[PDB]
């Protein structure tokens with residue numbers, strides 16, 4: 346099923362603001378069920394043709410997985426050099442700098458919010474982290490409170 | 498009143514205020530009539546709150562925001578034609594950014610900030626960020642409304 350439309354609008358807006366305000370080239374959010382299973386994937390910074398070429402959506406593997414069990418923020422300067430990295434699939438843009446956070450409400454997990462490749466070639470900042478966390482928290486509020494499906 | 502909602506709305510106000518680096522931030526939630534249902538804020542000391550006495554009714558620029566729900570971003574709130582004025586003992590405030598707190602179906606209130614640091618006006622960036630936070634608040638309110 347498609348995401349509830351208000352939830353989707355809210356999540357795309359949160360991803361866009363996060364991406365813009367930390368000056369990331371790419372931004373993404375995975376929306377999960379309560380068991381960390383990826384349900385939806387919201388992103389920006391990649392053109393449609395490149396999206397078609399990559400083909401398959403992410404499974405929430407590699408570095409992204411770390412955000413789920415160690416729910417504190419993670420910054421890396423060369424994300425795919427991390428030993429948990431699965432690697433980029435064919436056609437995916439190479440990415441180096443990373444800032445990622447879990448999306449939570451209290452102790453419930455709702456997904457992940459992560460950004461890559463700060464445009465000045467610089468590492469993500471402390472201020473960037475704090476902002477990203479606040480956005481994630483807002484995202485957790487949206488997902489937790491989102492309208493559940495209803496038959497006509 | 499609702500305590501877990503109230504705490505959610507306060508967290509959103511805190512996020513808007515601190516991230517934009519405003520001195521003051523508020524959210525007002527109204528009924529279909531416009532009776533206030535929630536008014537949460539930060540940046541003003543309890544002593545000044547008592548001095549003001551009466552709660553806002555949602556007039557002036559806020560009223561405008563209720564009437565025409567779209568972002569409103571001003572160098573000087575007192576200079577807007579729809580400005581009603583501050584009551585006695587209210588802290589002076591000058592720069593203003595307000596956005597609706599809403600979902601597609603309905604708008605429930607207004608999230609608003611004043612007096613960005615160093616006397617600077619609120620930016621487009623600030624406005625977009627506040628809209629994103631407000632939207633999350635809008636979902637939380639909608640969910641609460643859904644109570645029978």
Ligand code: HEM
Nearest residue numbers: 371372373388399401402403404405406407408430431432
């Ligand atoms: C635009 C925002 C995006 C960001 C910030 C992002 C970031 C990342 C990162 C950091 C990794 C893993 C590095 C590692 O652990 O090896 C990854 C892997 C991956 N990405 Fe992306 N990516 C984005 C967009 C996309 C899109 C649009 C697609 C597909 C349409 C995609 C498909 C994949 C796949 C299949 C993997 C392999 C790991 C997995 O299955 O989870 N990505 N991405």
Ligand code: HEM
Nearest residue numbers: 521522523538549552553554555556557558580581582611
């Ligand atoms: C701290 C966050 C606050 C902000 C950002 C804020 C801002 C504002 C603004 C922008 C106006 C409209 C001015 C105009 O239209 O000319 C206003 C008016 C008003 N304010 Fe505040 N305010 C805050 C807190 C308070 C508090 C704590 C109270 C007292 C309980 C209060 C009481 C009022 C009253 C009575 C009005 C007159 C208009 C109306 O009734 O809605 N304000 N304030």
Ligand SMILES: [Ca+2]
Nearest residue numbers: 469470471472
């Ligand atoms: Ca540091």
